[PDB]
Structure formats: structure tokens, C-alpha cells
Amino acid sequence: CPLMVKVLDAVRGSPAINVAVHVFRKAADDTWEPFASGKTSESGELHGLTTEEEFVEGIYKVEIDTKSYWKALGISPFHEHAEVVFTANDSGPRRYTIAALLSPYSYSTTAVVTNP
Amino acid sequence: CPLMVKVLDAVRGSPAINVAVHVFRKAADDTWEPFASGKTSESGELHGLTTEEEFVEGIYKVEIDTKSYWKALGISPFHEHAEVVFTANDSGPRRYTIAALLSPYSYSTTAVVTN
Amino acid sequence: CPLMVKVLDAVRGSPAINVAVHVFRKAADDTWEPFASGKTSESGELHGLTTEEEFVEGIYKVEIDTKSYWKALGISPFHEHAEVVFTANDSGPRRYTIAALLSPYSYSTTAVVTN
Amino acid sequence: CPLMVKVLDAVRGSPAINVAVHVFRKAADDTWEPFASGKTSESGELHGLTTEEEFVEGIYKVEIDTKSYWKALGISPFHEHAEVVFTANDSGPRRYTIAALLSPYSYSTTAVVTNP
Numbered sequence: 454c455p456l457m458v459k460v461l462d463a464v465r466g467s468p469a470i471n472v473a474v475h476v477f478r479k480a481a482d483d484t485w486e487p488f489a490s491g492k493t494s495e496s497g498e499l500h501g502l503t504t505e506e507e508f509v510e511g512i513y514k515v516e517i518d519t520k521s522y523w524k525a526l527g528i529s530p531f532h533e534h535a536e537v538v539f540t541a542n543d544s545g546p547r548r549y550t551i552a553a554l555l556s557p558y559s560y561s562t563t564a565v566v567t568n569p
Numbered sequence: 570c571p572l573m574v575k576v577l578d579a580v581r582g583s584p585a586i587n588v589a590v591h592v593f594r595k596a597a598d599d600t601w602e603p604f605a606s607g608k609t610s611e612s613g614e615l616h617g618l619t620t621e622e623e624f625v626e627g628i629y630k631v632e633i634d635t636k637s638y639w640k641a642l643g644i645s646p647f648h649e650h651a652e653v654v655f656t657a658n659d660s661g662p663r664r665y666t667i668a669a670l671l672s673p674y675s676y677s678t679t680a681v682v683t684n
Numbered sequence: 685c686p687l688m689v690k691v692l693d694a695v696r697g698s699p700a701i702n703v704a705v706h707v708f709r710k711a712a713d714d715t716w717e718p719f720a721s722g723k724t725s726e727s728g729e730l731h732g733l734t735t736e737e738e739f740v741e742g743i744y745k746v747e748i749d750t751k752s753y754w755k756a757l758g759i760s761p762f763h764e765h766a767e768v769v770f771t772a773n774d775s776g777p778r779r780y781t782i783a784a785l786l787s788p789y790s791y792s793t794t795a796v797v798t799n
Numbered sequence: 800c801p802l803m804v805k806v807l808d809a810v811r812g813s814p815a816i817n818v819a820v821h822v823f824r825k826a827a828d829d830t831w832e833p834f835a836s837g838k839t840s841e842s843g844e845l846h847g848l849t850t851e852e853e854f855v856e857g858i859y860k861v862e863i864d865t866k867s868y869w870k871a872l873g874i875s876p877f878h879e880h881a882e883v884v885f886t887a888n889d890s891g892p893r894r895y896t897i898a899a900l901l902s903p904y905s906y907s908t909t910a911v912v913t914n915p
């Protein structure tokens with residue numbers, strides 16, 4: 454599992470469960486190709502997005518569908534999504550955790566990058 | 570101006586000065602059309618991006634070129650850029666400030682929407 | 685004024701208005717002595733806390749009464765208060781802004797230190 | 800383990816390892832009594848601070864020694880520590896994770912509270 458996403462809710466003090474996440478990879482022609490997608494579990498985690506074979510070097514975009522999350526809770530939020538765009542694996546394979554902490558009008562995101 | 574951008578640096582404890590910021594508006598075919606851009610001032614602010622007449626309801630993306638900012642300071646960054654995507658809604662307050670707080674491997678962003 | 689406090693609300697997307705803020709200075713016996721206090725304005729800011737003559741090097745604590753803020757808005761909060769503890773250093777820049785971004789179960793804080 | 804602390808480094812993109820953490824509990828006389836302490840592991844986590852017997856209702860302060868962390872990395876940071884003050888267990892026992900994300904001039908903190 455070289456790519457994991459973790460999402461927390463700053464209003465509830467809980468994991469953000471059932472959050473849709475879409476990952477894109479920039480293609481040769483500079484468009485964003487779908488790469489993988491999933492949704493967070495009861496613990497706010499999304500495992501199993503990709504494999505070390507498929508997760509090659511590239512520029513990746515992790516789109517966390519925050520609007521749909523808040524709307525399902527009955528809240529009208531500010532942002533459409535939280536986006537995280539980064540070059541991956543450019544000095545060899547790494548493991549990436551992308552974490553996000555959500556509020557209706559704000560979010561924060563961080564990356565934890567480790568070398569297997 | 571109905572749209573202001575403020576950028577801060579969490580490593581140096583300072584405004585993020587001379588950061589490129591690009592604003593896009595989502596077009597009918599779901600593509601992102603350039604809308605406004607500029608660089609942040611000595612106070613980390615970018616004023617004058619648009620006018621009330623131009624800034625209609627729609628989906629907007631603010632892209633902050635964080636990678637170039639960090640590189641100009643000699644610091645190794647994670648992200649290509651920081652992106653903030655939101656809907657402008659006339660039912661809410663009329664002035665939008667998009668604030669971002671930057672670190673090499675993280676960022677925070679908030680909206681301050683006032684009348 | 686060498687010390688300003690700015691408070692924002694991440695739930696409403698607004699300044700955090702009428703929030704009590706208390707500043708303390710660490711005394712020789714390691715106790716916290718009251719130094720300055722006030723409430724944030726309509727812009728979420730608290731100006732005029734101190735003067736250059738009064739604000740000497742030392743360890744300071746800024747306590748933001750977040751629990752009362754959230755309760756006055758009808759929102760259930762986690763923290764008793766948000767605390768920011770730092771050393772004022774004359775070797776660095778001369779104006780300190782302590783900024784805080786509040787959510788019910790989280791907060792962010794940064795320092796903007798400029799000349 | 801009803802109280803866990805997790806600390807991340809926003810400069811390195813890593814767990815914050817070897818961070819000292821001190822927990823205090825407000826006593827009857829309004830002073831801060833030492834309650835427990837420890838340091839984060841290689842994963843940025845601190846487990847084993849307390850037990851469900853000892854972790855009674857009260858007002859707790861979790862002090863994360865950020866200054867000492869940054870100084871050990873050769874960096875002069877702004878804050879002395881990151882402090883998190885909260886009432887715990889007032890509607891019965893809960894499990895609390897206090898997470899912090901550190902930069903030299905900034906930090907963010909959140910709580911994840913779950914009911915066993």
C-alpha cells in the first residue's frame with residue numbers, strides 16, 4: 454500500500470467516514486487521467502488505492518470530496534473538494550499518507566512520506 | 570474587490586511574499602478558464618484580482634504556486650501547488666478572503682466571507 | 685503595538701468576534717502573571733494590548749477563551765481554551781501577530797513576526 | 800489506552816519522533832497536578848500514558864514539548880510548547896487521541912474522541 458488517505462472531522466472530533474476520494478495522474482498530454490478512487494472507512498482511512506507496480510513516478514492529484522461529505526451531514530460547506538497535488542516516486546518508490554482535517558470553511562492537509 | 574488572497578509562511582513566521590497566485594473559473598465544458606492572477610505583496614496579500622461586475626456566481630479555483638515559493642527560499646517542498654476550489658454564492662456575504670498558511674509538507678486554508 | 689491577536693472561525697467562515705483573550709507573562713517563580721487582555725473586534729482582531737515599553741523579552745502565554753465563544757454560538761466545543769506560549773526575542777523582528785483559526789474540536793495557530 | 804498522542808512534522812513530512820509530552824490534571828485547589836508523561840515513538844505515537852482507572856473525569860492539559868523537539872533538530876522555533884486543555888470523561892469514559900502537526904512558527908491540533 455504505497456498510497457493511503459486519512460480524513461478527520463474537526464467539528465465532530467471523529468474520523469470522517471464515507472468520504473469519496475479520487476486520484477488522478479498527469480498524462481503525457483498534460484491532462485489529468487483517472488488513476489484510482491475509493492472511500493474512507495469507519496476509521497477515516499482509505500487503503501488499497503493502488504499497488505507498487507501501478508504507482509509509478511508522476512504528478513498525482515488526490516481530490517477529497519469534502520462538499521459531498523458535509524452535505525450528507527446536512528451542512529452547506531465552502532469548498533468543493535480538498536486537493537493535494539504532488540510529484541511521487543521521483544527518487545524511487547516511497548509510501549505516502551495524505552491526511553486531511555476538515556471544517557465547513559477550512560481544511561488542513563499534510564503528507565507523511567516514508568522509504569520502505 | 571470581492572476576492573482577496575492572503576498567504577503566510579509557517580517556517581519563517583512571515584507573510585509569504587512574491588508568491589504567484591492564479592484564479593480560474595469553471596467553464597460550461599468543465600474546463601478551467603483563466604480568470605485573474607498576480608503575485609503576493611510584502612504583506613502576503615493579493616488585492617485587486619477582480620471587480621464586483623466580473624465576479625459572478627460559479628466555481629472558482631485559486632492555485633498558489635507554493636513549489637516555486639519554497640524553491641526561491643532554498644527549502645525542499647512536497648506539493649506542486651496549493652489549490653482552493655469553491656463556489657461563489659450570492660446568497661452569502663459579499664467579500665471573500667482566501668487565506669493559506671504554508672509549510673513544506675502541509676498547508677492550511679480558510680475562507681473569511683464577510684459583508 | 686508590538687503584539688496583535690487575530691482570531692478566525694472555521695465553521696462559519698468569519699472573524700471570531702467578541703472572543704476574550706488574556707495575555708500572561710511568566711514571572712521569576714514560574715507563575716503566570718496577568719499582562720494584558722481584551723475582546724476581539726468585529727474583524728476578529730485585538731489591538732492595543734501593550735506598548736513597546738511594556739513588552740520586554742520573556743515568555744508569554746496568550747489564552748483565547750474558545751469554550752465561551754462556541755457556547756455563545758450554540759456549538760459544542762472540545763477545548764477549555766486555546767493557549768499559545770512563546771518567547772519574545774529582541775533579536776528577531778519587532779511586531780508579533782498571533783493568529784488562531786478555531787474549530788470545535790481543533791485549532792491552528794501561527795505567528796507572523798515582522799519589522 | 801484511553802489517552803493517545805500523535806505528533807507529525809510538517810517540514811520533513813514525517814512522524815515527529817522523540818517528542819516529550821507531559822499531561823497535567825487540574826486539582827481541587829485549581830493548580831495543575833502532574834498526571835503522566837512520555838515521549839513519542841518512531842511512528843510519532845505515544846501510547847501507555849494512563850489507564851481507565853486513573854483517567855478519571857477532570858480538566859486535563861497535554862503539553863507537547865515542541866521547542867525541545869525543534870532545538871534537537873538544530874532549529875530555533877517560535878513556541879515553547881503546544882498545549883491542549885480539555886475536560887475529559889464528563890459523560891463517562893471516552894478514548895481520546897490528541898494529534899498535533901508541527902512547523903517552526905505554527906502548529907495545529909485536533910482531538911478524536913470515541914466511545915468504547
Ligand SMILES: Cc1cc(/C=C/c2cc(C(=O)O)cc(N(C)C)c2)cc(C)c1O
Nearest residue numbers: 552554561562563896898900907908909
Ligand atoms: C492536517 C492534519 C492532520 C493530522 C493527522 C492526524 C492523524 C494522522 C494519522 C495518520 O495515519 O497519519 C492517524 C491519526 N489517528 C490514528 C487519529 C491521526 C492532524 C492535524 C492536527 C492536522 O492539521
Ligand SMILES: Cc1cc(/C=C/c2cc(C(=O)O)cc(N(C)C)c2)cc(C)c1O
Nearest residue numbers: 666668670677678679783785792793794
Ligand atoms: C492559523 C491560521 C491563520 C491564518 C491567518 C489568516 C489571516 C487572515 C487575515 C485577514 O485579514 O483575513 C489576516 C491575518 N493576519 C492579520 C496575519 C491572517 C490562516 C490559516 C489558514 C491558518 O491556519
